[PDB]
Symmetry: C2
Subunit: 357 residues, 2 copies
């Protein structure tokens, strides 16, 4: 089995990584936990055993086969290239390496073949992108895809533990203390990086991440660029609106597509039903459809409200839900590691393609 | 001046109806309140005076110039045709008369001209439709409209007072009592007229109203059929996804359009800013966009996030917000009554077109 390192083990983010690793089929001989100098010496569990946290350094990766990063961009940018130098295969959680042409950007049910030519780093995509790919892939491989228009309904856990706590506090202030939503004080949402903060309680904030020069946010642009790379077709037109709503976990998406040939709805339903990682939840006669609260805790991506557009003969609308911390992050990462092993691709890379810092 | 009646004053669809009437430019001599015999003897305030509630009957409408309905579809269906007969001009909030070709379906900024041929009843559109029309009409008249694709983020007050309270109970249970949202008991949402009920707390429910035979909901189909009637153009393609979210007041909408000719975004913004009833809230450098919580208490429709589609040359994306109880209902109704007064249309009807 492997020596596996979890880099950024201590966060709420790491905790999901650990849980998914604990339930993995990955043959694991040794687990190592890496984090900041602050956390080194402390103890976290892996299954029955107490694991001592080590400090993430340039030399910490010796003898490691697989490292799952679950921290931020700066940690990945600094330490991933050293891990590759040490002979590690890296599965990165962040946006940092995603648009690098030497880096496969992978959802294992969609483009596992992209893993074959990796150069030591495989990038896990954005959570909202991931669930859209699982839902749309079975459609694409039978009927093609010309364009996508998507509107998201994103949960606050996608912005971290702080955002969750902010949301709970604001809601209690409203419901228990009688404060008006417009009187609330926010510190984190819509974006911890950006200059201004707004209440999420009883609100809907059409900003996730910061704005780019073209007036779309990074989140919306990631949905555009990542789709193109995962499906290996730059000719797929994609435009998104990303909105934060007062949901703690699980993202929902309203998805419009136009296929390349007319896709009978009955067959679209059947193709999704038969697709790995996807679950058809569509029985409007009994009001069955994906719901954020039902998706929490599950690795699956749920699809429903599937229906023909009213005018465009190739247009299809649907509703796509998934736990943003599982399939949207930690599960897709662990699954990438399982798939690398499945395809015999856990090996040192001979040539370094990423500069050290 | 005018004797004006509020049918269904007892509900909280009438609460906002009263508040908009109190600040109206409408010359009101006598204000009357109508409801069922369940409350026909109590008291409710107009400005500072106390009003006797009367029973809604078949002959209670005599001497009334305008009646603003804010009850249920069944109340309108039975009592509005008597009001017309009596001499009243009816402004109906409900869906019941919306698709009747004898009933004008009006948002005053958009199609005031449709009021001219009224036959005693004017229909106020669905909330989500109303705010979308105010946002898109300035764009249609300069550059045309080919299609609309809309996804809504709709507030719970759209489904009544009982829905607001259910939402609060549920959130309080999650936060104070430790109940998992998947374990919450629900009785009203997604729809009071449907078989199963699901929690809205920390959820998003892709069902508003009940389902029709084409797998869209009636709410989705309203946005389609009503847009066609309001803009008087059946060729405009409209598909909708309507979603309930945990917000008490103010609907938000992600709106995509394709225009007939290319509309420069800069000009698109200026046209919206200059359109009555709409406010431009679009400055991404300082993170200015419409928000539900800022819109609560305002008659305006707020528009921002305006930007070109990345590939479709005539495609434009935007974000639209409005208080669903105001411009989405009460205000639009009062505004219609106001507009009928400006156009000389508050008078008894020539010929009766709805059966007694």
């Amino acid at each position: 089995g492997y020596t596996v390192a979890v880099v950024g083990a201590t966060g709420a983010v790491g905790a999901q990584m650990i849980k998914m690793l604990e339930e993995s089929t990955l043959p694991i001989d040794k687990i190592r936990y890496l984090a900041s100098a602050r956390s080194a010496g402390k103890s976290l569990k892996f299954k029955d055993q107490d694991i001592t946290i080590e400090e993430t350094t340039e030399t910490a990766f010796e003898g490691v086969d697989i490292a799952l990063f679950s921290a931020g961009s700066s940690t990945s940018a600094k330490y991933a290239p050293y891990a590759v130098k040490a002979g590690v295969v890296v599965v990165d959680n962040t946006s940092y390496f995603r648009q690098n042409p030497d880096v496969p950007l992978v959802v294992p049910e969609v483009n596992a073949h992209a893993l074959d030519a990796h150069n030591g780093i495989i990038a896990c995509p954005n959570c909202s992108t991931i669930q859209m790919m699982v839902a749309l892939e079975p459609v694409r491989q039978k009927w093609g895809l010309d364009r996508i228009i998507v509107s998201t309904y994103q949960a606050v856990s996608g912005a971290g533990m702080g955002a969750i706590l902010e949301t709970q506090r604001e809601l209690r202030e409203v419901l228990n203390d009688g404060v008006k939503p417009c009187d609330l004080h926010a510190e984190i949402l819509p974006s911890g990086g950006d200059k201004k903060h707004y209440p999420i309680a009883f609100n809907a904030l059409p900003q996730i991440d910061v704005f780019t020069d073209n007036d779309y946010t990074y989140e919306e642009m990631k949905m555009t660029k990542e789709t193109k790379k995962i499906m290996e077709d730059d000719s797929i037109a994609v435009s998104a609106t990303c909105v934060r709503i007062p949901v703690l976990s699980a993202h929902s998406e309203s998805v419009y597509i136009e296929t390349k040939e007319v896709a009978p709805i009955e067959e679209v339903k059947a193709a999704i039903a038969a697709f790995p990682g996807a679950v058809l939840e569509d029985d409007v006669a009994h009001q069955i459809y994906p719901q954020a609260i039902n998706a929490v805790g599950s690795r699956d991506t749920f699809v429903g409200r599937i229906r023909k557009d009213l005018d465009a003969e190739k247009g299809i609308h649907m509703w796509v839900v998934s736990d943003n911390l599982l399939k949207g992050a930690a599960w897709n990462s662990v699954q990438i590691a399982e798939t690398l092993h499945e395809r015999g691709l856990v090996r040192p890379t001979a040539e370094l393609k990423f500069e050290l810092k």
